[PDB]
Amino acid sequence: SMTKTWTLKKHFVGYPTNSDFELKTSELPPLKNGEVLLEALFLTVDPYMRVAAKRLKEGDTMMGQQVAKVVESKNVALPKGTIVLASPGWTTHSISDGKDLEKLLTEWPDTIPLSLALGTVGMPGLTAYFGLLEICGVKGGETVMVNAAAGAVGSVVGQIAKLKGCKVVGAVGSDEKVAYLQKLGFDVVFNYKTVESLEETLKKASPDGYDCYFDNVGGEFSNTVIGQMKKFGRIAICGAISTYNRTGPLPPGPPPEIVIYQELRMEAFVVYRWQGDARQKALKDLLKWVLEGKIQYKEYIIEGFENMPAAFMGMLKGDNLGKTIVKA
Amino acid sequence: SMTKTWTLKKHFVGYPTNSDFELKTSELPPLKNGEVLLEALFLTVDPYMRVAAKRLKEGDTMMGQQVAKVVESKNVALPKGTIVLASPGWTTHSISDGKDLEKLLTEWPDTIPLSLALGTVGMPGLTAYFGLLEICGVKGGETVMVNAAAGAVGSVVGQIAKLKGCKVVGAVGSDEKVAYLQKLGFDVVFNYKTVESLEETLKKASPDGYDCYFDNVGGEFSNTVIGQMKKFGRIAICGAISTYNRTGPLPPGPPPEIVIYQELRMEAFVVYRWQGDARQKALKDLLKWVLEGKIQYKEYIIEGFENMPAAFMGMLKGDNLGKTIVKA
């Protein structure tokens, strides 16, 4: 089959632009025994791609995950029709020998979109699950501050927090995202771009401070939040998207005198640390919570593979309510 | 009784200067029942005073600890002659009701200087004890990076690490301090002020990276050290002295992408968290290790109460080998 592929023509400077991407067509080689041919059904764009793209050489395929269907098979375990998760990058077709492939949960129902395996019941949901439950170690009754709270990770973080008996304070980048999270049952939601004083807004959202901080943004926003952590407060360091598209130098680090006096524990993590029984258990919990109504989901489906860079840039700018997904 | 007292005349701007301090004489009231009159024998000056002094109002007494002798007693538990640790600030005499007082270890011998209870077998030694053994959680075989390594805290950290079976790499601020730490048994010691590249020196000191980082300095030094932490490395955040006397804005924070990829655990602490049985047990371990020779000690005794500001400023600027102590 003929395949389409998005490649990094020029390393990003600040935010990506259309000129930074280049579409290339290629013919795929024939299948050898044991291999399968995968047709992409849904591809994801995620903030981490902005950082990962710096490690690429110009001309390389952009990295990313997809839900795909086996359309040609010489592997009996993966017959035609099998749905899998694969990470060949931003490409419409690929060949795999089956080792780097994951099948969906065997209990996956036909009533939830297949693309949820890239969002709330996929990598972002697992990031929220372990970052909140093990790094922050929330145990109930605490107050959690989560930013980028309408994103793929943040929205799952807040909903798990509510389901564990927590107060949740969410910061988002648009008025539409404020309304969306209020429907979900977030205690406080505010638009960090428009508030008069971020420090006063956080103080009013939790005058006694915050037990936990699920941090996706970093930068100066996290310096202000660190000034309102309770003593022995815990910060889960997940991402720093406010810094990824920076053109200048990094902002000042968190004020060390506040950090010491409050004796904060700040641990970073990557979702891929958890595997095996622990990972399967978390995925099942995510699916159960979705079907019970305890976790709601929202998607922003963009049609057309060659619109993928536009989907990535819009996601980077906070312009899309719900998980940005490209339908092939 | 008459007392002398050093007070903060003007909040420090950068490093302190002489005009920021003011000496005042006053007469103390008579003792009420249950109270004692304490005469200072040894007073300590410590880096934390630079930060703590910012919370004072002008005219307040400078904070600090001292070894003192009861010269008048209406308190049955604390008769005349009793030696105690007390924290009335930079004063030659004070009155206490006994509740904020600490008694010496009953196993404290007369063969070691009394002033050691303010240094290696006092608060700085306890800071090293808990920061290294519980925050970093060293278990033997690890490689520890310690800065301000010839100071009261840093020097104890390295020596405890050696007796626990660890490699220690110490950074100090003077050539005289380099010889001192090699005599104590540090694996690598270097003068961070004079090396051509801090990054290259740390790499040659430990090509495998560092399991633990006992951080007293903060700032850019810690950004470089963070770039050489092993995966899941632990940082004990004790102080940031490179920042206490800062006049401009804070330097850039550690690169969040390195922090996340390495999944570092960075926890701050204050020595006063540990009290009761735990504190006395650690003190007994410090005294025992001192008496066994496993922990060596050095003091820089400055005579005269009226020299306390000069002793404090010299300590802040790195001009003193060993624990700075003022003999009244």
Curated annotation (Swiss-Prot), chains A, B:
Gene3D superfamilies: Medium-chain alcohol dehydrogenases, catalytic domain, NAD(P)-binding Rossmann-like Domain. It is found in: Cytoplasm. One of its GO terms (biological process) is leukotriene metabolic process. The modification N6-(2-hydroxyisobutyryl)lysine is found at residue 177. The modification Phosphothreonine is found at residue 17. It catalyses: 13,14-dihydro-15-oxo-prostaglandin E1 + NADP(+) = 15-oxoprostaglandin E1 + NADPH + H(+); 13,14-dihydro-15-oxo-prostaglandin E2 + NADP(+) = 15-oxoprostaglandin E2 + NADPH + H(+); 13,14-dihydro-15-oxo-prostaglandin F1alpha + NADP(+) = 15-oxoprostaglandin F1alpha + NADPH + H(+); 13,14-dihydro-15-oxo-PGF2alpha + NADP(+) = 15-oxoprostaglandin F2alpha + NADPH + H(+). Its EC number is 1.3.1.48, 1.3.1.74. It is an enzyme of class 1 (oxidoreductase). Its main location: cytoplasm. Keywords: Acetylation, Cytoplasm, Fatty acid metabolism, Hydroxylation, Lipid metabolism, NADP, Oxidoreductase, Phosphoprotein, Prostaglandin metabolism. It holds the Pfam family ADH_N_2. The modification N6-acetyllysine is found at residue 177. GO terms for molecular function: 13-lipoxin reductase activity; 15-oxoprostaglandin 13-oxidase [NAD(P)+] activity; 2-alkenal reductase (NADPH) activity; leukotriene B4 12-hydroxy dehydrogenase activity. SMART domains: PKS_ER. The keyword Acetylation applies. Changing residue 244 to A/F: Markedly decreases the catalytic efficiency toward 15-oxoprostaglandin E2 and (3E)-3-nonen-2-one. Belongs to the NADP-dependent oxidoreductase L4BD family. Monomer or homodimer. This is Prostaglandin reductase 1. It comes from Homo sapiens (Human). The gene is PTGR1.
